Structure 1
Amino acid sequence: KPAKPLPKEMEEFVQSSGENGIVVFSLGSMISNMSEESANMIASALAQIPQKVLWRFDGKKPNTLGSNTRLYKWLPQNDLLGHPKTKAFITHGGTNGIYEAIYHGIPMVGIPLFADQHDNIAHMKAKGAALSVDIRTMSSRDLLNALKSVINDPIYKENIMKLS
């Protein structure tokens, strides 16, 4: 699972998303162990989307961050995934978050690094419950496009929700 309310200041930010709703990037645990320009290429993508973004982040502030995007050292990932404004989930593709993504039926953009992460996202994509990015090159536009598909094209939400 059941989802509990969010902290006030965070609820306030989610509610400011009107009918566009929210994107959650959690955990982004391996972003700090990548180049400043990767975080940038991503922040560039997140910025150009009408959704508010809550991005689970600890390192240096990306200098492409949007006014849509807020960086938090800790997020209630699960509480957010259960929010009625959540449209998409961004994750490395650790099994834990994909279980919560499935539970609450929130379709995903994967950004894997290690085989574990690649094969988990490959699986959800084969089930049309996610799109994936990077490994092979990546442009902001590649992520941006991935993000507008899953958010706006309702088939990805049908597909994740046939898994729960």
Structure 2
Amino acid sequence: HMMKPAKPLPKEMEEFVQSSGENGIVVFSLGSMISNMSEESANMIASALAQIPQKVLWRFDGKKPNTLGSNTRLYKWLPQNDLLGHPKTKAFITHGGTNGIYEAIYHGIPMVGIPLFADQHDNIAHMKAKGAALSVDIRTMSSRDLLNALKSVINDPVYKENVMKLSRIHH
């Protein structure tokens, strides 16, 4: 692995991240297929995210979900790598592209994959077998299923321990 250092966040974004206190944050990025899917999918995701105490930064560019939580901010662009390096970061939600999984690995951030394409399926299945991720299919699963996965990856420290083992293979 090359090193993948983080820089500081934009000022307004750092302030939102700090507002999470001891709860910390969840980064959902890029989420690049969500806006080609139904309004319903986005609402189901938004419902799940609204039920955790963490603040959530969601890279998103569609219509605002009607079930958006007050804990969740929507951003057309994010500095994903900088967020993943932030000490407040507890979990990463991603479709499961290679680039963003390399960054999760480097920064030691466990994952909830929302895979759609073959390579994402494969990548997330590999992270899952390593103990570093859980997965949901947003086309078949419920808001509750995603919520349960989030709570697990956020709070059970063994997921983070398992992803940090992968950077030391890589280190």
Q: Specify the TM-score bucket, using the shorter chain as the normaliser.
A: over 0.9
Aligned counterparts of 1:116 and 1:3: Cα–Cα separation in 2: 26
Asked if the contact 2:134/2:153 (under 8 Å) is kept, the reply is: yes
Match of 2:157 among 134, 139, 154: 154
Q: Deviations over 1:91-136 (max 9, x none)?
A: 0000000000000000000001111111100000000100000167
Q: What secondary structure, in the 3-state scheme, does the structure 2 residue paired with 1:162 have?
A: helix
Gap change, CA 1:98 and 1:51, over 3 Å in 2: same
Give the paired residue count.
164
Q: What's the counterpart of residue 83 of structure 1?
A: 86
Gap change, CA 1:38 and 1:7, over 3 Å in 2: same
Gap change, CA 1:117 and 1:19, over 3 Å in 2: same
Q: What secondary structure, in the 3-state scheme, does the structure 1 residue paired with 2:34 have?
A: coil
Q: What secondary structure, in the 3-state scheme, does the structure 2 residue paired with 1:121 have?
A: helix
Match of 2:7 among 4, 9, 15: 4
Q: Give the TM-score normalised by the residue count of structure 2.
A: 0.94
Moved over 6 A (4+): none
Q: Give the TM-score normalised by the residue count of structure 1.
A: 0.98
- Tell me how far 1:2 sits from its aligned partner: 1.2
Aligned counterparts of 2:53 and 2:100: Cα–Cα separation in 1: 24
- Tell me how far 1:151 sits from its aligned partner: 0.3
Asked if the contact 2:128/2:135 (under 8 Å) is kept, the reply is: yes
Aligned sequence identity (%): 99
Q: Structure 2 stretches of 5 or more lacking a match?
A: none
Q: What secondary structure, in the 3-state scheme, does the structure 1 residue paired with 2:92 have?
A: strand
Gap change, CA 1:65 and 1:135, over 3 Å in 2: closer
Q: Deviations over 1:9-59 (max 9, x none)?
A: 000000000000000000010001101011111000000000000000011
Map 1:1-164 to 2 at 5 A: 1-134=4-137, 137-164=140-167
Which stretch shows the higher mean deviation, 130-139 or 101-110?
130-139
CA RMSD of aligned residues (A): 0.8
Q: Deviations over 1:42-97 (max 9, x none)?
A: 00000000000000001111101100000000000000000000000000000000
Aligned counterparts of 1:135 and 1:12: Cα–Cα separation in 2: 30
Asked if the contact 2:41/2:138 (under 8 Å) is kept, the reply is: no
Q: What secondary structure, in the 3-state scheme, does the structure 2 residue paired with 1:135 have?
A: coil
